[PDB]
Design a protein around this ligand. Structure first.
Ligand SMILES: COc1ccnc(N2CCNCC2)n1
Lengths: 39, 156
């Protein structure tokens, strides 16, 4: 059986660590909810 | 059980020890997570029981105790924060500028951050702290990096 446990408040935090890039990707979404890369 | 607004871990005792299978958001008495985390199954919150109310495998979303409540949207311009809740680790805000998933049905924001699979369902926030979507349904790109869609449901 599955259970939930609280992990925190939902807030924007000033001075959070900034990382990750911003790619533009052509994708497809199938009937099963899976995304795939289209080229 | 616990109905306080906030971010929650989704756990199971079926495998070895206690295992985190995903994450979710409690807002206005409704629990919001990704479909692939629970497969639509009932959830426990202490001694209380959360039953599925709405779900869709194609959107990869599910709500418990009521209809989907999250309706904020990425503005297509500003940086956002992934409120990451990794297995066995503390909740941690990570700021990033989203990329784009271009599809035949329109464009969707995407966050290029890599976390273990049990982090699926962690909320993505705007500058006012509003949940603009959930992290955890995406693609593995050419370099092995994970890129998730900013997945948002519709509020009726
Ligand atoms: C947190 O969301 C998800 C969902 C599915 N797979 C993943 N991976 C892909 C491979 N392992 C690292 C990240 N993350």
């Amino acid at each position: 059986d599955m259970y939930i446990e609280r992990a925190g408040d939902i807030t924007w935090e000033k001075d959070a660590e900034v990382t990750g890039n911003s790619p533009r990707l052509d994708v497809a979404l199938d009937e099963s909810g899976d995304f795939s890369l289209v080229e | 059980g616990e109905t306080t607004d906030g971010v929650y871990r989704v756990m199971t005792r079926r495998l070895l020890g206690s295992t985190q299978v995903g994450v979710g958001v409690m807002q206005e008495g409704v629990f919001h997570t990704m479909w692939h985390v629970t497969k639509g199954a009932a959830l426990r919150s202490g001694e209380g029981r959360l039953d599925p109310y709405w779900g869709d495998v194609k959107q990869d979303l599910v709500s418990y105790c009521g209809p989907w409540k999250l309706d904020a949207a990425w503005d297509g311009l500003s940086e956002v924060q992934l409120l990451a809740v990794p297995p066995g680790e503390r909740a941690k805000n990570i700021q990033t500028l989203p990329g784009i998933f271009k599809t035949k049905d329109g464009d969707i924001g995407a966050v290029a951050l890599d976390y273990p699979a049990g982090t699926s369902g962690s909320p993505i926030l705007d500058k006012c702290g509003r949940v603009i979507g959930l992290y955890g349904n995406g693609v593995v790109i050419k370099n092995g990096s994970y890129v998730s869609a900013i997945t948002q449901g519709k509020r009726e």
